[PDB]
Symmetry: D2
Subunit: 306 residues, 4 copies
């Protein structure tokens, strides 16, 4: 039976987490690590267990870890966390939670980065990156997901792990087509040999070996910042034939750069602008505007078997 | 393998849909039907099929029904729909879509009501409900979900059906408790014999018999308005011991009132206020304020096995 | 020079406020008062004064009332408030603040109602209105604005008072036209003798006598619920020729029903739907959908001179 | 009498606008211009004038320019614009509109940048800035405001002009204090000699000479990007004693760098996190979390005369 409870929107901000170093650059991305002067995370915790049943059926709170207590638990654990990644932070919380509370059989954790970008400051006359001042970003952010279970024989196993990148909004001004689609009684969409493809991208990847996701050995760790740069680079390089076409080629490229990954999952959305003006005198430019609310979307998983 | 595409946020508004009448009443609710002078729905459509593979791998759009064409299909079918429910509308769209498109093997549909409330006007000497003017509501709304597949032998079969009520936000000012929970090093929440419990509720039900969702026989239909009325009534009658405790009781009342239902599912959130002032002289009143963002949540399925 | 500081989003919820009764009724509305079992308010406070200067220019906080302390002030005063309206609560907060902090020369307050709607419960055999369970509403809400100054001779004076209704969203399915507008090289909008006019309305009114706003003499108070009912009634009654034409008619009706009002200010928007389908066989019905983002807006003040 | 009408959320995206080049650099910023490969803007247009009266009072649309036509006018004008700034674009629209429609006495325009960021693409062997693929940013954006009147002698005069930068969210991890403020019965906030000051900033500036805002002479133009960089630099450099003290010093630096500016206006908000963990073993690190909803705010003008 379905039976879970927990805490969502657990925001937790940590200064001076152990820096993530030793990630090898790939051609698409300069990412080599994170300074972690500021490390923000938004945690959602959810726990399950057959012994929680009376809390529902009888109003018996004896075996109820208050959700407020779970919040305290996550926040103290971020203080005491000695690792370098969100993925590793989740495992640390999950392990430590299951050991503390034996009546809990399953725990599920989501960790969403709260990204901060660097800013410019002048020190004694010269402009450079600040080590004190940071700009909160509302753009793309890394994610992580972990499900941990307590088996009958009293051991703890990770049953599901998934890392990700969310809120990536990319527009390519030209070099995009959508042609040859079904033309029938329901079709009003004109063919377009040259559109400004505007796509929202949620990319998720699973590791062949779960240990690689924690960052303990950084050479095996796949950073969301790297996945971002692959997506932009592939979009640039491709004469896209559709979004479906685009995300296949993005996923192929990710799995080629990262042979430690089993699969790459995509959730895309089409928010492409409507054309108002085709031609301006003496320039190559055009004018576009926002479309009606309806948006296209695609879901697609690319495995190593492709 | 995971392979889907479609269209979201398909808003469609129909005037003068066939009225919902002939429903079976229950003690908790005076719900007697819907006028359907104004019928609003927000439709998400997703389709799959192995024959779509090459639209991704090769960028071959030959068998691609444009997502924009899916929008036209939905809107046109809301015009020609002869029934009386969202659930029934989904089945009309799904069956019709698969019949039109032989290479599509599965279709999933979500439909979310866009509620409107009655307003009143003075005309002809008296104040009376307006047949023309309606107020858009951003409160609770009904939902529907339907998954339909094309089988090997070319029949169409519904594999999943679920109806629902979303966005229900209820506060009970007194007559609630949360005591007896685990007290340890992680616990800073005080025991509370009398709190103003504030809950967000999303409730979803499944029928034993799928045909009962359509409203063709209105007696067997379960209206979201009736479910709303059960929830608010049970909340009032109950000396709550927790949210877990409350949603079980709601779930049981729903299953008792509707024997044609197989199960009920809850997704609740806790948004209870913090107390600022406990005692006002010459008054039973108190002052409260908004809490920090972390919210408690609870997921639970009550089945006929209760 | 502009110099202010303060606190916003000061949420405060009070139970068992003194009920608003003894109101004077109008034909358009059955509004007879407020129970005030649950009273919710969202306050924003701004304060000024030339003596706050050094807190900006020198970093001198000696005369700085902490914005956190302002939040505590408002929340404690909601507990001690013996009145019946948001407008009267603002006066009480304002007067009390300037009396406490002599160095402050001006104070501006905004109060927004946090709506709650009656729910129903089965109890003791019958189905009746609950005194405990309330539904949070995200629809229309009352507002209040007050600006108070400390005069050079130490007395206090209200320089501005303004009450309001916000978030009112109304659609009239028929009996609306928009024709006769300018047709030139920038005009693509077709003339329309029968459209479904959808408006967002923000209505604000000022009293001739400030003290009528407080609700001390309730018969003189103009309730936002009554304004709402006038708006829906006039929209229904009127074959509108534009939104412009409609809001003038609502404003005139307001000033006729409430002669103690000086003026009524409107801030409207046009979110009218796009027609998809005109003809549905054997029914007067039609289908519509959401337009592109650009919305029309209108600003108009009606005074006793009309 | 208040009498206005127009169109909001006019989204307009132009490709290959004339590049902004030759901007006078400052030490705090690298900014030297904009490529304008992609240029997005969100315009709100408002028009007024006494001959519109009958449009409201009688429902006579003879002199009504449809708001939909205003949208067309703005969009078509983005195509024909030969200038290089948002401020210049508003002037071009305003002037052109008043010349075309002689019954209109006044026009007010708001222009909001829709910012796009550069991305990485593998080009000519190594990753470099793509000239095709951009990332939509939901962070800070440039703004502009222009009001223009037709005088009785039929000349067109700019009566108000203001440029801006909105949505800047800055957090400084240390080097911030808030002490010495008033401590009475309403004060619960502890003094803090070391807090992680988190500020939301809206900065607006007016020019001594209006013609400096258009960018026709790029030597005299003040770019939002440069203002952005002055703000992060000054925040870094300053041991802040309050937000009030911070924004004053930010303003001074702006007026010093830009003698062609008459004034700088600030609207700031305090969203500073609550401390959970003050001390972590073997580390200078700390953990924080989101506070309750209430937020402090400051409004302040710095002029050349400070
Ligand atoms: O109803 C509740 N259930 C819980 O699990 C919980 N935890 N803190 N408060 C709570 N309230
Ligand atoms: O890339 C696209 N894929 C689709 O399936 C589609 N339908 N309309 N536009 C589209 N673009
Ligand atoms: O009622 C309206 N007034 C207007 O000014 C307008 N412009 N487009 N549609 C409109 N409708
Ligand atoms: O910078 C600040 N200014 C203020 O006025 C204030 N009040 N609380 N914290 C504050 N911080």
């Amino acid at each position: 039976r379905v039976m879970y409870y927990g805490k969502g929107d657990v925001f937790a901000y940590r200064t001076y987490l152990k820096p993530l170093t030793g990630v090898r650059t790939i051609p698409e991305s300069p990412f080599s690590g994170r300074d972690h002067i500021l490390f923000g995370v938004n945690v959602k915790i959810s726990v399950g267990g057959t012994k929680l049943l009376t809390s529902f059926t009888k109003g018996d709170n004896s075996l109820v870890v208050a959700t407020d207590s779970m919040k305290n638990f996550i926040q103290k654990h971020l203080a005491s966390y000695t690792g370098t990644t969100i993925e590793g932070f989740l495992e640390y919380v999950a392990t430590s939670f299951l050991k503390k509370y034996s009546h809990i059989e399953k725990i599920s954790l989501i960790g969403e980065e709260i990204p901060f970008e660097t800013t410019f400051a002048v020190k004694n006359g010269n402009r450079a990156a600040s080590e004190l001042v940071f700009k909160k970003s509302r753009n793309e952010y890394a994610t992580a997901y972990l499900n941990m279970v307590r088996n009958e024989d009293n051991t703890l196993n990770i049953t599901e792990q998934q890392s990700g990148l969310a809120g990536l909004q990319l527009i390519k001004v030209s070099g995009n087509s959508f042609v040859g689609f079904i033309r029938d009684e329901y079709t009003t969409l004109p063919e377009d040999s040259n559109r400004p493809l505007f796509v929202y991208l949620n990319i998720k990847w699973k590791y062949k070996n779960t240990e690689d996701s924690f960052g303990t050995n950084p050479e095996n760790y796949v950073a969301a910042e790297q996945i971002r740069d692959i997506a932009t680079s592939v979009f640039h390089e491709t004469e896209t034939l559709s979004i479906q076409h685009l995300i296949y080629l993005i996923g192929r490229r990710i799995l080629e750069r990262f042979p430690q990954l089993q699969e790459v999952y995509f959730e895309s959305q089409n928010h492409t602008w409507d054309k108002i003006v085709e031609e301006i005198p003496e320039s190559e430019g055009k004018v576009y505007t926002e479309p009606r609310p309806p948006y296209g979307f695609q879901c697609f998983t690319v495995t190593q078997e492709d």
